[PDB]
Structures are given as C-alpha cells and as structure tokens.
A paper describes a structure:
ASFV AP endonuclease (AsfvAP) catalyzes DNA cleavage reaction at the abasic site and is a key enzyme of ASFV base excision repair (BER) system. AsfvAP belongs to the class II AP endonuclease family; it mainly catalyzes DNA cleavage reaction at the 5′ side of abasic site (AP), generating 3′-OH group and 5′-deoxyribose phosphate (dRP). AsfvAP possesses many unique structural features, including one narrower nucleotide-binding pocket at the active site, the C16–C20 disulfide bond-containing region, and histidine-rich loop.
In the AsfvAP/DNA-2 structure, each DNA was bound by two AsfvAP molecules, but the DNA did not interact with any R1 residues. Cys16 could undergo subtle conformational changes, whereas the conformation of the neighboring α-turn and Cys20 of R1 were well fixed in AsfvAP/DNA-1 and AsfvAP/DNA-2 complexes. AsfvAP does not recognize and cleave the mispairs embedded in the middle of the DNA duplex, but it is able to remove the nucleotides (either paired or mispaired) from the 3′ end or nick site of the DNAs in the absence of abasic sites. Rather than substrate-bound or product-bound state, structural superposition suggested that our AsfvAP/DNA-2 complex may represent one product-releasing state.
Residue numbers in the entry:
A (entry chain A), B (entry chain C): -2 to 40, 41A, 42 to 296
DNA sequence: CCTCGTCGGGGACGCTG
DNA sequence: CAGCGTCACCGACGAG
C-alpha cells in the first residue's frame, strides 16, 4: 500500500439523525460510503471520542463494540484527536493525565491507533515531564501535533526544535510517542511551504533526523490556511483554496502540497483533512473538490 | 481706568541675584521698574506664595510687611497662583483645605486680591463640595482657572459646562468664588479662538451668563499656545508667536486676542501673561515684545 | 480542568504647568 | 497634584 488518506469525521455532520447508541460508528459508516461514492476509498480517519470542549467521554459502551467491528471491516487507520483540555504539562495535571489515560485505554478497546495531543509553546523539558506521568497502553501511540503561535520562542515548526524535542524524548526512553504535522500550523508559525522546493527542503530535513523520529511514527494533517505565514492563527482551508497553495491552482504538481503527498506515499503515512464548516452539504462540497484533486495527484 | 495688564513674577528671575532678605517685595520692585522702563506701567501681577512643587509657604514675615507697602504704593492688583497640590476635591481634602486657609489668610495680610486654583476634570459637585470645606476670608476671592485635557469628559472650556458649574456655585450661596480664563488652556481643550469672530462668540456666550458669573469676578491669563487645538497639553507661548495667533502676526486687530482685549477693557478685568522661559534676559525680551504689541493695541 | 490571537479597558511612568 | 503619550498587562472573547 501507499499513503493512507482521510478526513476528520464530525459526529454532528456525519452521524445519522436517528442514531441512539452507536452514533460514532454510524458517522464512520456514512463517511466510508461517501468515499466509495466519490471514487476515493478512504484508508484513514480522525474522530473525537471526548469533548472537545469538556473533559467528558462521549462514546458509549454500545458504540465501542460496533466501532471496532466497523474499523476492522473497512481496514481503517483511525486516530482520536484529544480534547482541548489535554495538556499533561499544566499545574493540575493529575486529573488531565488520568483523563488521557482513559482515552488511551478506549482507543485500544475499539482499535483506534493513536491519540493526537497539542504541543505547547513550552520548553521541551516540561513537555516530557507531563508525558512521563502517562503510563502507555499497547497499540496506541501519542501523536504530538505541531502548534501555532507568533511571538513565542518554542514553535516546534522548525526542524531544529522538532529534533531537540524528540531527542529529549528518546533520551528519556519514552515509548509510543509520535509526531503529527499540521501543514496549516507550521505555515501559520513562520514556515513557508508554498513552493515545491520550500516544502522539499523542510521535508528533507525531517528525513535527516529519522533516527530521532522515524516515519513510522509520523502522521499528517493536510490543511491549507486562510491566514498569513507567521500570523499565528489557525484557519484551515481546502487544498489550493487558502493562502498557501492558492497560487498553484492550475499547476498542482509544482506545489508544496504535492511534495507532501510524495512524502506520504513514500513513507506510507496517514493524512487527515481537518476542515469543518457549517453544513453537511457545505462540507461534502469542499471534500469532493479536495479528494478529486488528490485522485488526480495519485493518477 | 481700563484693563489691568500684567505678567507672572517669579520671585527668582526678578529678585536680585542671590536675594535673601525680602525677595518677593524686591522682585515686584524690579518688575514695576521694568514696566516703567519699557513704557508700559503694569496694573496687575501674579506671584507664588507657596510651592508650586511642594505644599510649603515660601514668603517670610519680613517680606510680608514690605510687600503690603509695595502693593499700596503702586496701586497694584495682585493674585497668587496656588501650588499644584491645591485640590480641595481630592483624597487629602483635610490637609489641602487647611493649607489653602493659610494661603488665603496671607493674601489678606499683604493685600493680594485673590488665589488662583486649578479646576479638575471632575464632576462639578465634587468641586463645590471641596469649596464648601473652605472658610473664606474677606477681600480675597478664589479664582477657578480653566483646565486643559483631551480625553476627559469635563473640560470646563465650553460655556455650557462653565455655566452649570457656576450655577451650582450660586445655588449653594458660597461667596467670593471667581473664574480665571486661560486662553491657552481653553484652546488646548478644544476651543478654537484664533479668529476674531470665534473668540467673539465664545466671549459673547460668557456675557450671556453674567447673572451666574459676573465680570467683576473674572480674570484672564493671556497666553498663546505652542501646541495644537484640542491636544490637551499646557504649553504657553508669547502673544502672536504660538499656534493660536501666529497667523495674525501682521493683522493683530483681526485676531481673537484683540477680541479678548476688548472684553478686558470693557469690564476692567485683570490680565496676566504667564511666560516660562530660561533666563531673565530671555523673559524680559519676550515681555517687551508682547507688551509693546499691547501698547499698540491700546493706542 | 487548555491555549492560541485579538481587542479594549485599567493602571504605571517620567514628564511639564 | 493632574494632565498626555506610550505600552505592557489582565480579562474578557472565539477559536481549534
Ligand atoms: Zn490539533
Ligand atoms: Zn491538525
Ligand atoms: Zn488547526
Ligand atoms: Zn494655572
Ligand atoms: Zn494660567
Ligand atoms: Zn498653563
């Protein structure tokens, strides 16, 4: 197999109005159907199992059982984005760490392959401190997502900072820790990835530290951005419709995105499209454009 | 007689170099002599009897006796500008109100006809509340000077606010309260008085509330301004040398200043020229220019 | 139970009448 | 003392 492409599945916008106990499983079912209809069978997906605005578990025991069968039936590589309250490097991180411990156990329970956590603009020593309090579970790897700020030293969007972080992780013998790369986050953090060569040099530098972070522990969030490079604002957009790759609307194979797609296919990485909008028709309209553009890129 | 013109007499820049014995009286003598020399006998004067940077009485009992004889000898109309600490409507409204009682009693002791107090950017009732705490002394009237601010609500530079303020004063029947109009203060407070008619309508509006504030209790600070209209900055300048009446350097009888002089001559008001320069040579140079300009205006 | 950014109001400051 | 300009800080507010 090559790359494993997919999108973020909102419970609201994908679950059938008449679900009762297995709502998350139903949202996946319609999501899988949508891909087969548009001619792009998905191999990956991202969902919420909690929050994301409150540290509360959303899934139900009925949904757990049927979700595992749904994932195995369609051979899906699924991660769960943690709630926005998941910051192990905080003051009262005793509740938070236990809450993440719960999410990790559920992911193993239902066949989800990881949990995405946001990185703070904090020194790497504090990050591993919070990570040290988390006892891991097998089969589930914590993915650390690239943050987005403006006037903070620690951005974790340059390779020098990513290496230094994961070097401390490897020196601490911390198991099952990965990296999630959000193109919009590193772009709103100062890293210009518009042209093929600029994304090339960045990805080449990522490959140069594979001993610290191997591509087996790397996933991608393929997002365009409706903001400026270095602004520090998270405003996702559909591919080639935001300020990163809008200029490459009719030369898509010269864009920094195609260089990312080449990396994803080369290292068989997961790629998630996190874009949310007001309506189901609006979302499936944008998703049809993006995934048909990927279909042409993989043709 | 007509108007009573004069200037502010610093008891340093006018007293004999290194004065010790009766300095305020000596400063007046040279000030009177300076007028006789330049051909402009002064009828008014303004001095400090305290501060203005510290709540301490500067005059001495020796100076008191000779100053009274000096004032009567030349028939001078003298006021004392209060220190910058004189705010009866403040937190320390117990100490300040007693300090003013001291200054007020000294003015009667030496023949000074009033004390100038600055108005705050405060509601008018706090002002009369503070003024009600002051037991008056006869023959001495408290003159309230117009302030200078940009963003505060209360400017006391438009006639609508002056009227309600002094209306509040008359309704409380507290005696011996006057008004001091600083052309530079009301100008840096938003009131353009550059042209003859603009000063005309403002002074005309002052005459319209003569039942509330009679011209017998009105004095003037004739200052140009080295700032912009409405800036909120107190920067005095010589007449026709600042940003108010510089445009009327060779058409002085078409300026708003001449309209003020007409008012002063009409109601026999005192007019004080407050100039802060560097040396005695700098000050007496600027004063000769202004007072000779007034000499031509009164010809 | 988290953080980003922005925006807009509050107080601190070393001036100057 | 009470003005101003300047500006950082705290506290709301939508984000994701
Ligand atoms: Zn995220
Ligand atoms: Zn993301
Ligand atoms: Zn994002
Ligand atoms: Zn004054
Ligand atoms: Zn004045
Ligand atoms: Zn002034």
């Amino acid at each position: 197999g090559g790359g494993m492409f997919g999108a973020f599945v909102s419970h609201r916008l994908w679950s059938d109005s008449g679900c009762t106990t297995t709502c998350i499983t139903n949202s996946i079912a319609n999501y899988v159907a949508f891909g087969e209809q548009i001619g792009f069978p998905f191999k990956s997906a991202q969902v919420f199992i909690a929050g994301p605005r409150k540290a509360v578990i959303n899934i139900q025991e009925d949904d757990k059982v049927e979700l595992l069968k749904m994932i195995v039936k369609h051979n899906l590589w699924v991660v769960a984005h943690g709630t926005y309250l998941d910051v192990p490097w905080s003051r009262r991180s005793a509740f938070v760490t236990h809450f993440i411990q719960q999410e990790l156990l559920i992911c193993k329970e239902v066949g989800i392959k990881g949990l995405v956590l946001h990185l703070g603009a904090v020194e790497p020593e504090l990050i591993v401190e919070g990570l040290k309090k988390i006892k891991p579970v097998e089969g589930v790897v914590i993915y650390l997502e690239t943050p987005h700020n403006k006037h903070h030293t620690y951005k974790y969007s340059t390779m020098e900072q990513i290496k230094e972080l994961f070097l401390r992780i490897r020196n601490t013998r911390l198991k099952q820790i990965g990296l999630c790369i959000d193109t919009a986050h590193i772009w709103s953090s100062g890293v210009n990835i518009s042209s093929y060569n600029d994304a090339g040099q960045w990805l080449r530098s990522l490959e140069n530290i594979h001993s610290v972070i191997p591509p087996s522990h790397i996933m991608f969030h393929l997002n365009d951005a409706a903001t400026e490079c270095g602004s520090g604002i998270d405003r996702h957009a559909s591919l080639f419709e935001g300020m990163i790759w809008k200029s490459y609307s009719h030369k898509i194979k010269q864009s920094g995105l195609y260089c990312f797609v080449e990396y994803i296919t080369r290292h068989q990485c997961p790629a998630i499209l996190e874009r949310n909008l007001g309506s189901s028709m609006q979302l499936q309209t944008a998703l049809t454009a993006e995934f048909t553009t990927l279909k042409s890129l993989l043709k």
